[PDB]
Symmetry: C2
Subunit: 312 residues, 2 copies
């Protein structure tokens, strides 16, 4: 019967490559996604999470360009994207479903660990491209880490693992009343305790939206985690006469085949973590197939329920 | 015993005049406010709303200055401020109360009426100051309304009345579970139906935070609406030997005395609307006095429960 579903929307689901980060461009993509997601809303308990790459990136560019006031830190920018994106998802979904279906967009703080190795190895580029001269000045003045970007440079920030989502109880209480809940936007607002474990503060970082959605689905006791991506499945023998879509795979087999690395690595790693932690299923696939995904008829289902690998 | 409290935080409660709109400056004001608000949290059902003037104003400035992409419309900027401000309020409050006290920051869409007279008389200035030349260009290209601002010009936008808050059911469900809920940030995200009443869209406008908080308190069946302001009360004979603070007043008397006009007009008008609509009390006063306010010992209490006027 009913299932509790966490759907993690990909970044490309809100803005495609090659189009500017405008409200109009985002809304038309959100409308397409909402039309697809709404097909699995009736009778179910639906949580929608999403990325925020282009959105938080633009806020960083606009703040860096504006010299009259010192721009907000990255955690605060994350919070702003949760408002911007969540608003659009809620409004588009509400235009599709019976108005009796309640909606809530919840700001989501996510604790990260101060000892996370990501803080010694920042990886996520953000902000404008700087000359060597300006990148040097900013590193010395602000303590920023940078990465080469061609013959220029860009700031990079840590991407630590999510450790706990603060607002789990409110989300559960809303789902129990039939609410569709939008949360963990952008992977959540990254927050961290001081050494004493007494005071929570923001931290300048991003959280991977699929790892956060996996944690969210674990903490919400979801029945299924759906990692929505452009591709309709993971494949073996990709680009070869023996190319085959993976219908279902045990985490042990996915790791042996090398799927925890590559371009799909982070999504496979998040699906594996959910499957191992819960004994429930994570499915990597397309929003266009979301009904079939919930029926076990599409997507790559990552589960410990059955060892080995099954194709379709 | 328990009371359901809506506290509407003033704009000056988040950022004082004469200091730049930075995260650090906002956080120190939020911390002061949270310390005060947390004193009436135990045993009560607490809703916190707030303004967003300086915050949405800065987003408008940063977007207008950045010419590479077309900036977001004002409703979307409103949504972003709800994330930024709500995040800070939730984090500061959570550092003060037992972690068992649940928190939720909810994005709040507010319906406005397309026939609202505010759409023919826009009043709220926003964005940069333009020369005559640039203001003319933007009015012709974008249909903007402007106002003189010295020998220059500024865009003005409509401030329509709030008609309904969309997410009332989720807020009530959270309050019933003991959650402290932050919502109606900035007066809400202004939204409007098309002529057919079928499709909800954003609209470029702002909503007065006290009128929205009054509507919120009405729709949530709150016991008390607290309009938090810099002053500790409304006064008669202000600046004169017979100066007296107003302890309690019927709306009929406040209107006779002229308090529905002046610098306190909008707050008095919102308090009067709550009092007439509910038979419950709205109090205009200081966060420093919030405990005494809930005890009936401070602030100007606006109520239909007793005719006339009472001083202290």
């Amino acid at each position: 019967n009913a299932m509790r579903i966490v759907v993690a929307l990909g970044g490309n689901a809100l803005l495609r490559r090659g189009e500017p980060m405008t409200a109009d461009n985002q809304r038309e993509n959100v409308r397409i996604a909402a039309e697809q997601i709404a097909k699995v809303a009736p009778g179910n308990e639906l949580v929608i999470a999403h990325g925020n790459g282009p959105q938080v990136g633009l806020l960083a560019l606009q703040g860096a360009a504006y010299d009259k006031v010192s721009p907000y830190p990255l955690d605060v920018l994350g919070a702003e994207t949760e408002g911007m994106i969540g608003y659009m998802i809620e409004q588009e979904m509400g235009n599709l479903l019976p108005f009796e279906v309640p909606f809530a967009t919840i700001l989501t703080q996510v604790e990260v660990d101060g000892k996370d190795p990501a803080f010694q190895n920042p990886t996520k580029p953000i902000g404008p491209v700087y000359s060597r001269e300006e990148a040097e000045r900013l590193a010395a003045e602000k303590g920023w880490s940078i990465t080469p970007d061609g013959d220029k440079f860009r700031r990079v920030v840590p991407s630590p693992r999510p450790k706990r989502i603060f607002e789990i109880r409110p989300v559960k209480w809303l789902l129990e009343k039939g609410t569709i809940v939008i949360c963990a936007g952008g992977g959540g607002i990254p927050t961290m305790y001081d050494e004493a474990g007494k005071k929570l503060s923001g931290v300048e970082a991003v959280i991977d939206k699929d790892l956060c959605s996996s944690l969210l689905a674990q903490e919400l006791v979801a029945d299924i985690l759906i990692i929505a991506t452009d591709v309709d499945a993971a494949y073996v023998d990709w680009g070869k006469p023996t190319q085959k879509a993976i219908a279902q795979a045990h985490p042990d087999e996915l790791e042996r085949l090398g799927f925890a690395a590559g371009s799909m690595g982070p999504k496979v790693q998040a699906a594996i973590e959910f499957a191992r932690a819960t004994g429930k299923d994570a499915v990597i696939g397309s929003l266009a197939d979301i009904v079939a995904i919930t029926e076990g008829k599409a997507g790559t289902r990552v589960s410990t329920r059955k060892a080995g690998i099954e194709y379709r």
